[PDB]
Amino acid sequence: HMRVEIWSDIACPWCYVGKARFEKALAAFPHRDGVEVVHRSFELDPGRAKDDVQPVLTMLTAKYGMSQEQAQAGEDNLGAQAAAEGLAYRTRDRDHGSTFDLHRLLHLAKERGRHEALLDAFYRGNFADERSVFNDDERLVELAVGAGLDAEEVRAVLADPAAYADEVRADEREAAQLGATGVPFFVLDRAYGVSGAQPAEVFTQALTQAWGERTPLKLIDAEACGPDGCAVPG
Amino acid sequence: HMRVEIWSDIACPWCYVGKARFEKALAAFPHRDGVEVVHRSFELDPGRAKDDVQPVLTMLTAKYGMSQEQAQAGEDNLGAQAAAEGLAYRTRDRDHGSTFDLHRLLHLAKERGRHEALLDAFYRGNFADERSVFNDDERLVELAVGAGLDAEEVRAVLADPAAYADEVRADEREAAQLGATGVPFFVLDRAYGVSGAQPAEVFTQALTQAWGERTPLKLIDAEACGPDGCAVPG
Ligand code: NA
Ligand code: NA
């Protein structure tokens, strides 16, 4: 088979839309049975302070020198494209903050086999839900418990800043080495990079090309165990 | 970086010796910091019955039409090569059996971040230890608890045959697709296959070649979030 790695941040509307687009493409791919999907941490703003939560629309108009009209229109468009993938998406009063701790908790999840459940919870918590996922540990606890995780434990991870920090940074490091400066970023078989919330069409194409072009392995050759037992040479 | 996947069985003396040889090679590799090692299930005898435990030396002489002298000599040699890697290895009275349940428990471990600890425990339980790891659930419980895992839980996995069965078969399936018919089998970056307990020299070589020859990714190209925010095109 082959592996598809997907770098994303929770505070990234196209990561949320692009995940659904990819999954839709994957479900129509002829070798979906041979594909493993691995989610990977990325922070769009790793330097941001935990207590720095801002309204999205303020951020667009203030931080990006864009009009309020234009800000609203981008969000309306994102709401339309989210609906079209079967995702809820609030087009008003969204907020934005640091995701570092969310990512540490995603690694707790990845190591409780619940990675995709907590990822979807956090996305839902962010984009579908009026309550903030930022600077609110009890919110993360509730979202995490809802995803199957244990609470005393999720709390221990949140209480201990070093808990899973290495793992978050290592994912971020790997993305930086692979050339990604923006998410979502999809790496198909460590041969092809796909960037942004592409049409399921492109994703389908990317899967097929990536699959199609894997050459058999190149061997280097000694003692082994095989259908007729183990070696005894020296 | 890059990933190195290692297929092995617990009832495989060269898997045990080859793991140590690889690790030794990895520790002297200039880009060890960029390598992720993932362990993968393989059963040399998946059809074997849980209650079918045999002395190794009987198996060699009876099942492989080899002399008893020769059987003992292979084991003595394996004991020497194990010592040379810092591994204990009993050259007498080893037994051999089904590993299916061990592999299911390794997947429990992989999903408690304790994969390498339980792998080394099971190897030690098999090759260093006079007590059998085969057809003895309480032994597996003890070995598993010693490796950091929870007991009521390890027992639930052992009580439920379907627990992690899919995961074991999927690893075995992948090995079969990659052409492996014997272990240990090392796949470096999905580009190079290395088979058997090779000299750390070859492993070093394999790492270097595999690392050296990764070409940058090929991209296919849309909306993303990046250093200057998120897209708004349509
Ligand atoms: Na929210
Ligand atoms: Na033993």
Ligand nearest to the Cα of A94, by number? 1
What are φ and ψ of residue A199, in 5° steps? -55, 145
Phi/psi zone of residue A93: left (φ > 0), alpha (ψ -120 to 50 degrees), beta?
left
Domain contains B80: yes
Nearest to B192 among A63, A218, A231 (CB): A218
| Distance from Cα A127 to the centre of ligand 1, integer Å | 6
Q: d(Cα B203, Cα A106) in Å, to the nearest integer?
A: 34
**Six-digit token string for B169:** 């078969």
CATH of the domain at A108: 3.40.30.10
Cα angle at A32 between A26 and A38, to 5 degrees? 70
User: Would you state the torsion angle of the CA atoms of residues A174, A52, A195, A24, taken in this order, to the nearest 10 degrees?
Assistant: 110
DSSP per-residue letters across A68-126: HHHHHHHHHHHHHHHHHTT-----SS-EE---HHHHHHHHHHHTTT-HHHHHHHHHHHH
Answer whether B15 touches A (CB < 8 Å): yes
Domain contains A224: no
Cα angle at B43 between A115 and B41, to 5 degrees? 20
Query: Are B133 and B140 a contacting pair, CB within 8 Å?
Result: yes
**Six-digit token string for B98:** 């089904």
Query: What's the Rg (C-alpha) of chain A?
Result: 20
Domain contains A111: yes
> Inter-chain contact A220–B44, Cβ cutoff 8 Å?
no
Domain contains B205: yes
Using a CB-CB distance cutoff of 8 angstroms, which residues of chain B are in contact with residue A60? 229
| Distance from Cα B171 to the centre of ligand 2, integer Å | 25
Cis peptide before B233 (omega within 30 of 0): no
Domain contains A220: no
Answer whether A85 touches B (CB < 8 Å): no
- By the 10 Å C-beta count (0-12 exposed, 13-18 middle, 19+ buried), A66 is classed as middle
Using a CB-CB distance cutoff of 8 angstroms, which residues of chain B are in contact with residue A181? 226-227
Specify the DSSP element, H or E, that contains A195: strand A192-195
Answer whether B179 touches A (CB < 8 Å): yes
**Six-digit token string for A97:** 């903050």
Cα angle at A186 between A157 and A199, to 5 degrees? 125
Domain contains B221: no
- Residue B20 Cα, gap to closest chain A Cα (Å): 14
- How many CB atoms within 10 Å of residue B19? 24
Using a CB-CB distance cutoff of 8 angstroms, which residues of chain B are in contact with residue A189? 190
Q: For B34, which DSSP code?
A: G
| Distance from Cα B95 to the centre of ligand 2, integer Å | 7
> Inter-chain contact B77–A232, Cβ cutoff 8 Å?
yes
Using a CB-CB distance cutoff of 8 angstroms, which residues of chain A are in contact with residue B74? 230, 232
Ligand nearest to the Cα of B90, by number? 2
Specify the DSSP element, H or E, that contains B22: helix B13-27
Phi/psi zone of residue A54: left (φ > 0), alpha (ψ -120 to 50 degrees), beta?
beta
What are φ and ψ of residue B33, in 5° steps? -65, -30
Give residue A68's identity as a one-letter amino acid code.
Q
- Give the technique used to solve this structure: X-ray
User: Would you state the torsion angle of the CA atoms of residues B82, B193, A7, B23, taken in this order, to the nearest 10 degrees?
Assistant: 20
Domain contains B97: yes
The total domain count for chain B is 1
**Six-digit token string for B73:** 């000599």
Domain contains A222: no
Answer whether A183 touches B (CB < 8 Å): yes
Query: What's the Rg (C-alpha) of chain B?
Result: 20
Q: d(Cα B106, Cα B115) in Å, to the nearest integer?
A: 6
Q: d(Cα B146, Cα B148) in Å, to the nearest integer?
A: 6
Q: d(Cα B46, Cα B98) in Å, to the nearest integer?
A: 7
What is each CA distance from A145 to A110, A159, B33, in whole angstroms? 14, 16, 34
Nearest to B231 among A1, A14, A189 (CB): A14
| Distance from Cα A24 to the centre of ligand 1, integer Å | 24
Cis peptide before A46 (omega within 30 of 0): no
Its domain, for residue A46, covers 1-211
| Distance from Cα A176 to the centre of ligand 1, integer Å | 28
| Distance from Cα A89 to the centre of ligand 1, integer Å | 10
| Minimal-distance CA residue of chain A relative to B77 | A234
- How many CB atoms within 10 Å of residue A109? 25
> Inter-chain contact B189–A190, Cβ cutoff 8 Å?
yes
> Inter-chain contact B234–A77, Cβ cutoff 8 Å?
yes
| Minimal-distance CA residue of chain B relative to A35 | B174
Nearest one of A169, A188, A223, A226 to A29, comparing CA atoms: A188
SS3 B65: coil
